């Protein structure tokens, strides 16, 4: 009832995932740089990206308003003759 009877298909699925993650273990035991070599190599891009975020956040303001848009509303009574 409460206990189950783990099938063979489930074992094979679990072994598939175990193998994938063992490959993941392998592809992470060889980094291109070290802790000290990497330090700073991305500073310029990070600074520029955050400055882009800042310039976006500090640009909010109401949109312009044109006389043409206001006077176009008189078209709602345009007639032939």
């Amino acid at each position: 009832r409460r206990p189950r009877f783990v099938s063979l298909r489930a074992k094979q699925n679990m072994i598939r995932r175990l193998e994938i993650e063992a490959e993941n273990h392998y592809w992470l035991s060889m980094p291109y740089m070290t802790r000290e070599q990497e330090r700073g190599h991305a500073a310029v891009r990070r600074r520029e990206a955050f400055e882009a975020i800042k310039a976006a956040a500090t640009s909010k303001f109401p949109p312009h308003r044109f006389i043409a848009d206001q006077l176009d509303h008189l078209n709602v009574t345009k007639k032939w003759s």
Partner: peptide
Amino acid sequence: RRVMHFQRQKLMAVTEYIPPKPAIHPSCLP
């Protein structure tokens, strides 16, 4: 002898000991 969570059950099943097959069967060879 309580029941185990199902995933612990699968983990116990997949990691079950598998013994090394003997090269020859002792009955038909010493």
